[PDB]
Amino acid sequence: LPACPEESPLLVGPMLIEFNMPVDLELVAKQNPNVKMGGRYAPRDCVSPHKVAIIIPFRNRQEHLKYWLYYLHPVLQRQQLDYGIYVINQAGDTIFNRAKLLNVGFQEALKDYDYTCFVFSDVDLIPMNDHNAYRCFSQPRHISVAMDKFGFSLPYVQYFGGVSALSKQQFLTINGFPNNYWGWGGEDDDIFNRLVFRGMSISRPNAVVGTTRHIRHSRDKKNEPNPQRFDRIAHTKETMLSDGLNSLTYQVLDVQRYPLYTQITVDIGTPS
Numbered sequence: 001l002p003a004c005p006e007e008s009p010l011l012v013g014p015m016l017i018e019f020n021m022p023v024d025l026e027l028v029a030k031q032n033p034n035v036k037m038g039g040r041y042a043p044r045d046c047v048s049p050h051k052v053a054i055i056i057p058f059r060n061r062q063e064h065l066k067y068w069l070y071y072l073h074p075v076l077q078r079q080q081l082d083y084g085i086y087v088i089n090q091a092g093d094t095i096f097n098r099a100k101l102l103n104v105g106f107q108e109a110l111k112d113y114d115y116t117c118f119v120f121s122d123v124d125l126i127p128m129n130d131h132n133a134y135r136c137f138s139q140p141r142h143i144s145v146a147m148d149k150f151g152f153s154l155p156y157v158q159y160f161g162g163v164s165a166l167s168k169q170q171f172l173t174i175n176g177f178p179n180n181y182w183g184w185g186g187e188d189d190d191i192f193n194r195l196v197f198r199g200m201s202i203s204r205p206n207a208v209v210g211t212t213r214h215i216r217h218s219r220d221k222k223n224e225p226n227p228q229r230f231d232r233i234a235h236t237k238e239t240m241l242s243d244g245l246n247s248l249t250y251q252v253l254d255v256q257r258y259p260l261y262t263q264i265t266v267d268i269g270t271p272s
């Protein structure tokens with residue numbers, strides 16, 4: 001097979017996004033015949049240079065996930081990616097740890113296939129334009145740049161939350177993400193710091209292409225704003241050296257291969 005073209009000729013641009021209708025994954029699976037068990041897909045007519053693992057931090061967000069799958073699967077295939085979907089389900093009912101789950105995703109997906117690109121996406125963010133590439137670039141990529149909840153612009157210029165993409169080398173260079181941001185807030189800013197402290201800069205599509213929708217939702221219990229976040233982001237340069245991939249442990253409790261995604265249920269513990 002020849003290499004796929006540099007830019008996909010299948011993209012249609014702006015799309016209409018809605019979250020007020022029910023979603024039936026069995027139907028979605030039928031609508032997406034070429035997506036194999038575990039939510040895997042690669043174009044059959046050409047070889048994609050983008051071997052992407054999409055990592056979603058998760059717990060009790062099945063409804064949002066259904067919307068995510070319904071909308072992203074068609075987009076990822078049009079982008080001609082060799083990809084896999086991984087939902088990292090946090091076992092238990094103790095304080096949520098978004099970034100630690102993301103690290104588990106990176107490590108576990110690598111055991112599946114030689115992925116060289118990682119897209120980290122919150123479960124409730126849907127891209128509105130398929131020209132917003134869900135793959136890696138020469139520099140870390142911020143994808144959800146113009147979310148409706150922020151007035152279709154960045155909340156601040158160093159904002160790196162929501163959806164982003166790091167190549168395997170970029171991720172390894174920053175020792176992955178921090179493992180000690182329990183509860184809401186700051187871990188995305190810590191990650192931004194790690195990238196800068198390792199000589200990188202943020203790459204972003206323009207504001208129109210980067211338009212993204214956030215599914216309105218209320219506060220989840222067990223992910224209360226972390227009071228130590230402001231203090232933690234002030235010391236990233238020092239703490240990233242020993243807190244991240246090189247200090248990670250967890251226990252996978254179960255791996256489920258669903259038609260549209262692989263769900264890894266994992267015990268990431270509590271604060272130490």
Ligand SMILES: CC(=O)N[C@H]1[C@H](O[C@@H]2[C@@H](OC[C@H]3O[C@@H](O)[C@@H](O)[C@@H](O)[C@@H]3O)O[C@H](CO)[C@@H](O)[C@@H]2O)O[C@H](CO)[C@@H](O)[C@@H]1O
Nearest residue numbers: 155156157158159161162184185186187188189229230233
């Ligand atoms: C640490 C934290 O809670 N981060 C969350 C972030 O919070 C906002 C962020 O603002 C940074 C910018 O604030 C401007 O006023 C100006 O100073 C800019 O130079 C600066 O970069 O941090 C402040 C406190 O540091 C916080 O009060 C703001 O709300 O918001 C995003 C979006 O919700 C979170 O993803 C992030 O974790």
Ligand SMILES: NCCCCCCOP(=O)(O)OP(=O)(O)OC[C@H]1O[C@@H](n2ccc(=O)[nH]c2=O)[C@H](O)[C@@H]1O
Nearest residue numbers: 057058059060061096122123124217218219220223
């Ligand atoms: N008035 C509405 C206030 C809602 C404020 C709640 C904070 O909202 P956001 O900043 O969107 O963060 P969030 O959506 O709660 O967390 C981000 C991401 O973590 C994941 N997440 C978080 C908490 C939880 O219980 N389960 C889960 O899966 C999910 O992928 C989510 O999209």
Ligand SMILES: [Mn+2]
Nearest residue numbers: 122124214217
């Ligand atoms: Mn949200």
